[model samples]
Target chain A: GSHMALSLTADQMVSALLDAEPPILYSEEASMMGLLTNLADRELVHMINWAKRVPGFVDLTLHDQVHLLESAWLEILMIGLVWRSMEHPGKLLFAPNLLLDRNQGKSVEGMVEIFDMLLATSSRFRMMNLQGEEFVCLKSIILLNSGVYTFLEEKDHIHRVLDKITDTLIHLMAKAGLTLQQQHQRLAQLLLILSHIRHMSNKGMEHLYSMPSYDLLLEMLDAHRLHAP
Target chain B: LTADQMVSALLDAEPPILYSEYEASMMGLLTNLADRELVHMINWAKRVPGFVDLTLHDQVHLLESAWLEILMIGLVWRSMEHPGKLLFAPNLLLDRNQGKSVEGMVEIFDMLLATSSRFRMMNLQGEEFVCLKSIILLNSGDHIHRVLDKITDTLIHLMAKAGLTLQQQHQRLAQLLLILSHIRHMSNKGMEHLYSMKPSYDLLLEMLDA
Candidate 1:
C-alpha cells in the first residue's frame, strides 16, 4: 500500500535522457549545414529539457538556471557532438541519422573548419575509450558552470551540485579498475579535452554567426551578449 | 608568461594534501604518503606551462614514462634536510632501521638517503630545485624541449643572482644537470623495487611498471 512518487537516480535519469532522442531526419534539397543546423537547433531544445531533469538543477532559481543554460549551451552541445562522434572514424556522427565526413561537411560555407575540430575531439575520445558515465558527468559539469555569467542569485547552489557530481565522477573512476596514475591521467585527459571543447564552442559561436542565425542558435548568441551594455 | 614566470606560478600552485587519518603500519604509512605525493605530481604535470599544449596521447605518455623520476626527485628534495632519514612527509620520517620493516624498501630507502645527502652537499637552492623539477617533468619532444632550454637559461640566471661568477655558475649548472643521470638510475631501481613489493595501494601499484 505504497502511494508515493518515486524519483529516478542520477544515472537512471541520464541513461533515459540519452536513450530518448527525437529523430531529426535530413530532408531532400536541404543543404548539408542547412540540415545540420536544423538538427542542432532541435538538439538544443532537447538539451534544454534535459537540463531541467539534471540532478539539483531545479534547486536554482529559474532566473539563475536560465542564465546557466544561455551561457553554456554551446559547450554542452559540443560535448555531445564529441561524445556522439566517437563511434565513427574520420567522420562526425552529429546525430543518429546524420553522419558527415569532412568533405561532405564542406557543403556549408565555414563548416569544414569546425567540423574538423569536432572530428579531432572525437579522435581523442576514441583514444581514451571514453565511458558513458564519464560523458554524462562531464556534460553535467559543463551545464552547471554557466561557464560564464557568474552574476546569479544561487551560484553557491550550483557549486554544491557540481561538488556532488565531481565526487560521483571520482567514485566512478575508482570503480573503473584503472591504476591510480591511469585514473588520474584519464581525468586530466578528460578535463583537457573539455578545455578544447570550450575553444571549439567559442569558435563555433563565431563560425555560425555569419550563417543563418535562426531559432535556438540565434538565441544562444543573444544570450552570450546579454551581459553587454 | 615567461618560462620563469610560468614555472613560478606552477610552483605556487602545488596542492597540499589534507589527510583525514594517519596510517600505523610501515607499508600503510608509506603508501598513504605516496598517494598524496602522486596527486601533487599529477597536478604539477597538468599545470606545466605548455603541458596541455601537446596532444593528449603525448601528454599521458610523457607522464606515464617519467612519473617515477618526478616522484623520486621530489622525495629526494624533501629528505635533504634530515641527512640520514627519508622524510616521506613532514610527519613520516624513517631512518634505515625502520625501513627494514618493509621487506624490500631498505635498499631503495638507502639510495634515496644517499641522493638526499648529495643534494644537501651540493647546497641546492630553491630556484635550482624548482628548475631541476621542471626539467625532469617536461621530458619530451620539440615543443617541450624548447621549454627545457628556457628552464636551463633561467637556472643560470638564478645562479648568477646568487653572486657566483659566470664560470662558477656554469660549473654548478653542469654539475647539477649531471645529477639527473644518477636520479634516473635511482628512479629505475625504485620502480623495480616497488613493482617487486607490489605495494597494495592502488595509487602505488598503478604508478608501477605497468
Candidate 2:
C-alpha cells in the first residue's frame, strides 16, 4: 500500500482532482428546479469521476467506493461550491457562470438557509486566503474522511489516502514558506471548515428530504439517509 | 428526556471491569491497562450522546477505527500531571526508561510522552480534555457529524465562558484540532506496534482484530 502512495505524485493527485471539474455551467435562464437538478446531476457525476482518479480510491472495493461517495456527495459538492466562490464575497459560484447571491437564493423554497451557510463558508475561505493546492487536499480529505460506514472492504485504503492528502497539505504549506506553526494552524483551519460543511450538508440533506429530485443526485442522497417526517 | 440523562451519564466515566491479570512485567501491566482502557472506551462510547443512534455495525466500526486514538488521548490526559511517566491507570505509572526496556515499546511510548509534554505546555484543562476526547470519537463520521458539531460548539462556548478572548479561543481551538491530527499519528503508530506484538488479551484482541 505504501507503494501506491509513491506512485501518485502530489501534482498528479492535484491534477486528478482539478481535471474532474465540470466544464459546463448552470444556464442562467432555466427554472429554479431545473437549474438545481441539472447542476446537481452534473456535479454528482463530476464528484464520482474525481473520486475514481484519487489514488488508492479505486483500490477500495467498488462497494466501498460507492458507499463513501454516497455518504459524502453533499459535503463534497458544498466544498467544491465553496472553493469556486471563495473569491467572490456573499455569493456562491455554483458554476463558473452561476454566481448566486442572496436575492437569487431567496427565489428558491428552501435555499436561503443553504445558501447562507455556503456563502458564509466561502467568506471564511476568502478570509483565510485558501490556495489551490490546499483546497484540493482539503476537499480530498472531506471525501475520504466523511461518511458513517458500518463496513468497508478496504478501510486501510481510505486511511492511506487520508494520510497522504494530509501530508500533502502539510508539504504544500511548507513549500509556500509557512512556518511550522503556520502550517499547523492552516491545516487545523482547513479541517475546521469541514465542520461547517458537514453541518451545511446535514441541513442540505434535510432540505432535500422534503423536495427530492434528479435521478443521480437523489440516488446518492437517498443512499446516505432515509427521510422520515 | 432519556437522551438528556444518557448525555449526563456519559459525562462521567463508568469504572471499567478489567479481566487481565496484571503481572509484574511492563508488557503485562501495559496489556492489563489496555484491557481496562478499552473497556472504558466501549462503555463511554455506548452512551456518548447519539453514539448508539448509529447502527450496531457503525458503532463497532467507529470504535474499531478510533479506539487507539481514544486510548492514547486518555493516556496523555492522565499522564499530564506527571512529567516523564505514563499513567496507564490509577496505580500504574511507568517512566520513559522503564517503557524503553520492553522490546518495540519505546517508539509508541515516546510519541505518547511527547504529546503529554505538549499538552502540559498548552496547560490543557480538564474540560478541554473531555471535549477533545469527545471530538476524537465523534470525529470519524456523518450522523456523528452533528454530534461533532455540538462538541466543537460546546468547546468554543467553554472557552468563551472561561473568559478567553476570541483570538485566544480560536488559537486554542486550532491548537486542540492540530493535537488531534498528532494523536492520529500516534494512534496509527500504536496500532502498528500493537499488531506487531499480537497482544493476547481478549478485549485487546477483539479491538485489534476488528
Candidate 3:
C-alpha cells in the first residue's frame, strides 16, 4: 500500500484540473461562477476518464456509468476543490487567478454554510496525511457511495469497488503503523468526511441552480441538467 | 481535569449496556442511555442562558431527532477504548457470537462493529468528545440553528481550551463533524430497525428500540 504505482502524482491530480479548458465563458476570469463551472464540468470529465481506467468500472452499462458520474459529480467537484485549495491555507484555489475565502464570495445567501463545510472538509482531507493513491481511492469511494448511487448494490459493483478501495486504504493505514484501534478510526474518519460533503452537495445544487451563480454557465441554460447532484 | 479522567467521567455517567443469558436465550442488559443522555444534554442546554427562548417545540424536535445520533456518538467514543469488542455491564462484553438466533441481533452487532471501528479511529479527547456530543444533540437544519450555532461556537472556544491552536482547532472541529456524518447514518439505520419491526417486548429488543 505504501509504494503502489499511481496513474497521477499528487501534483498531477491537481494540475490536470487547473489545465482543463472547460468552456468559453470560462476564459481566464476565475470569477467564482467561472471556476465552479470549470470544476462542475471539466473536472467531471477528468473523473469519468479516471474511472474508466479503474478495472470493472467500465463493465457497468453506459447508463449505470453515467448514473455514477451524475450522482457523484458534485462530490467530484468537492474532491477537485479540496485538492485545488490544499496549499492556500484559509483560501480555496478555484482557478489560476481565482482564490476565495468564505467571506469573499457573493454567493447565494444560505450557501455560506456549505462553503464553511467545504473548507472544513478540505482541512480534514489535508490533515489525513494521505498518499496520492489513497487520496484518489477515497475520492472514488465518495463517487460510488451506496447511499448516493444505489446502482452499486443493484449491479453488484458498489460493494466490490468501495470494499477494494477501503481495504487498500486500511492496509495503507496499518502499514503506516496505526494500531488496529487507531486504524478503525482512520478508516471511519476518511469516509466519514464524505457524508458531510454529500450534505453540502445536495444543498449546493439547490442554491446553484435556483439562481445562476455564474452568467456564462447559467445561460448555457441546461446547467441544472448537468448532473449537479 | 485531565483528558483521560474526563473520558472516564463521561463513561461513568453514561448509561451502560447490560447483558443476561437463559437456556433458551441471551440478553444484553441496558439503560435507556438515549433518554438519560438527553437529560444530561438538557442540563447543559439549560445552562446556556437565554436558550429557553428558542422554544420547547424546536428544542424537543431537535433533541428527538438528534438523540439516536448522539447515543451512537457516545457508543463510538467509548468503543475506541476496546477495539473489536463492545464493553457493556461490568466484566461483560459482546462480540458476534454473543447474539441469539435472531436476524435483527446479528445485524445490530454488525452495525455496532462497523460504527465502533470508525469511531475507534476518531480517537477524541475527553473534552472534544463531550463537546461534540453536545453539538450533535443540539444540531438541525430547520430548528433554532442560530442557537445551535452559538453552542458550537462555544465549543470552538472550548477546543482552544483543550490545547488546540486555531489551525489545529479547525482540523479538530472538522474531524468531529466528519465523524458526525457516519454516526448519523448509523443512527438512522437504528431508527429504521425500530420503525420496521413490531416490538417483541423483549428487554434487549426494547433497549435496541430505545
Candidate 4:
C-alpha cells in the first residue's frame, strides 16, 4: 500500500511538470519560462490577499476580470522591461537588446509587444481619464519611442517607426476632433524644431571631429549615440 | 494781468469739469447754451462768403477763429456759471487759426482736447459723441442717416470757422450734442423759453446732421 501511494504521487508530479511547460518552446526559452513561473507565483499571492482586501473583483463580469488580469500582467511586463533596460539590464538579456536592435525581426516584435502592453495597461488606469493632457503626452511618447516596424532592413525599420509615430499622432489628434491639416501644421513645426536641434548636434560633432585627440572624438560620439555596453 | 495772477485765476475759477455724473449734467447745460450762441455765430459766419467757399482760407480763417472763441467762451462760461461778456477776440492771429482747417477738424479736436486744460472735462459726453459720429460716419449717405451726418458736417464747418483746435473741436462737438439732446427732452414751457428767439431750425438741423 505504501508503494501504491508512492506510484500515485509520482503520477501527480509528472502531470504537474507537463502542465508547467509552455505549449511551444524555442532554444532560448528558459528565460521566458523563469519569468512566467515567477510572475505566476507572485500573482497567486497578490490575488489571495487582494481578493480578501478588495472584494470589488468578485462583483465584476468574467470579461472584465479577464481584462483586469491582462492589464495587470501587461503592467508587470512593462515595469520589468523599463527596470531591465535602465537598471537591471542583465536580468532581461534577450528582450531589451532585441528591442534596441534595428535589423532583427525579433526586435520589431518586442517593440510591438511592449507598445501593446503599454496601451493596454494605461487604458485601465481610471486616473488617466481625468488627466487628458498627461495621458496624451504619455501615449505620444510611447508611440514615438517604440521601435516597431512592418518592414525588414534597418532603413525600412526607421521609416516604418517614424511613419507609425506620425500616424499615431494623427489618430490622437483626430480623436480630439482637430482637423488633419492643423495636425500636419503642428507636426511640421515640431519637426522643424527637431531638425534645428539635429543641425546643432551635427555642427558640434563636426567641431569634435576637427579636434586632434581621438579620445575626445570617441567621447563625443558616445555622448550622441546609444551604446549597448 | 500778472502771469501769477493769470495762472491763479485760471486755477481758481476753473469749472469742476469732472468725468462724473454731476459734471456730465453741468457740461450738458453749458453745451446747450453754447449751441444757442453757435446758431447765431453760424448764421453770422456763413454770411462771410469765404466761410462757404471751400478754397477760401480767409473765410476758413474767420470760421476757425470764431469756433475757437466759441469753445473758449463755452469753457469760460461753464467755469464762471454765467457768460463772460468781457472775453474779447484777439486780433486776427493767422498762426493760431492755421491749424484749424475744416478737413481734419475731428483730428484737431482730438489733439486739442488731449492737451488743453480748459476743455479737459469729463468724457461721458465725448464718448457718446464718438459713438454718434462713428454711427454717422459708418452710415454716412443713408437717407435716414444722411440728415444727421449733414448736421454733423455743418458743425464741423462751423468749428473750422471758429479756429478751434482739433481737441477743442471734439469737445465742442460732444458738448453741443449733449445740449441738443438735453433740449429735445425739455418740457413745452422750457422749449418755448429756449426757442423764443426762433433759433434757425434749418441751421440747427444742419448742426445736428453734422
Choose the strongest candidate by TM-score: 2
Clashing pairs in 2: none
Please, what are the lDDT tens digits per residue for candidate 3 over residues A56-159?
45556556556566656677677667766766678777665667788875464565777787787777677766565566666666655523212224444444
Output the worst ten-in-a-row residue range by lDDT, candidate 2 chain B. B1-10
Each model's backbone clash number: 0, 0, 6, 28
TM-score of each: 0.48, 0.52, 0.48, 0.17
Off by over 4 Å in 4: A1-152, A209-229, B1-210
Separate DockQ for every predicted complex: 0.02, 0.05, 0.09, 0.01
- Candidate 1 segments exceeding 4 Å error: A1-30, A212-229, B1-210
Task: Give stretches of model 3 more than 4 Å off.
Answer: A1-31, A106-108, A146-155, A212-229, B1-210
> Comparing candidate 1 with candidate 4, which one achieves the higher lDDT?
1
- Candidate 2 per-residue C-alpha lDDT over A90-130 given as tens digits, one digit per residue, 9 for 90 to 100: 87777776677878878778788888878888887888888
Please state every model's RMSD to the true fold in angstroms.
22.2, 16.7, 13.4, 36.8
Lowest summed lDDT window (length 10), candidate 4 chain A: A143-152
lDDT of 3 at A11: 42
User: CAPRI band of model 3?
Assistant: incorrect
List A-chain TM-scores for all predictions.
0.78, 0.83, 0.72, 0.27
List per-prediction Cα lDDT, in the order shown. 0.64, 0.67, 0.54, 0.32
Q: What is the interface RMSD of each candidate, in Å?
A: 20.6, 10.5, 9.9, 31.2
- TM-score (C-alpha, index-matched) for candidate 1: 0.48
Q: Residues B50-133, candidate 3, lDDT per residue (tens digit)?
A: 335656655556556666676666666666677666664335566667754555666665666666665555456665666566
Better of 2 and 4 by TM-score: 2
